[PDB]
Every structure is written in C-alpha cells, then in structure tokens.
C-alpha cells in the first residue's frame, strides 16, 4: 500500500529543503509550486522512495 | 485523488484527540493500535471525510 500526500503537506511536516532532496528538484522551485497552489500529490512507496504527479480533472472546467 | 496516511502519522499530526474524533473511535483505541504496530491507514477523501482500513498482504507470511 503506497501512502500519497499532497506537496504542502509533505513539506510542511519534512521540511522544504528534505522535499527538495527527496524529488531532486531545485529548491526554489516547490516554493514556487506551493504558493501557486498547484495540484501535486508525492506517492511514497513502501521502499520509502518518493515521486510527484500533478493532477486535474477530466475533463476541464 | 485521495490522500493516504498512516494511521501513526496521521496522529502524530493531528493529534490523537482529533483522530478519535474524525473516526468516531473511543480513544484509547488509537494508542493501542498504534503501540501494537498494526498496518492501518486512513483515506481522507475530498470533500475532508475520513475512513480507515487495516492491510495485509496475500497471501500471508
């Protein structure tokens, strides 16, 4: 069973820079994604790797 | 898309308080389950509701 997490949450309880670690990202750029509120989920497997997705609706609006 | 968590995580964040609660559990039952290390985890839906599911694999040992 995976555990899945939305991107502020993940990073509010790690810590942005761990986050950042964690997808190899730059840094900046979850801020970034944080304020702009988007819709990414991280998946944790069980192996304790992470990866993100960005998720919308289908159809749109 | 649902988040899925823990049921120690969720706990840990929320408090073992609000988790009774969202569950509708008697208290003392989330510590116990906790402290016996069972595979249960919360699904929070949406529209913020919460259930809970303990998992095994298949087959077993």
Do not use: C
Not at 39 to 55: Q, R
């Amino acid at each position: 069973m995976e555990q899945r997490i939305t991107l502020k949450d993940y990073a509010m309880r790690f810590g942005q820079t761990k986050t950042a670690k964690d997808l190899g990202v730059y840094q900046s750029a979850i801020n970034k994604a944080i304020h702009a509120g988007r819709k990414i989920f991280l998946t944790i497997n069980a192996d304790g790797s992470v990866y993100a997705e960005e998720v919308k609706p289908w159809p749109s609006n």
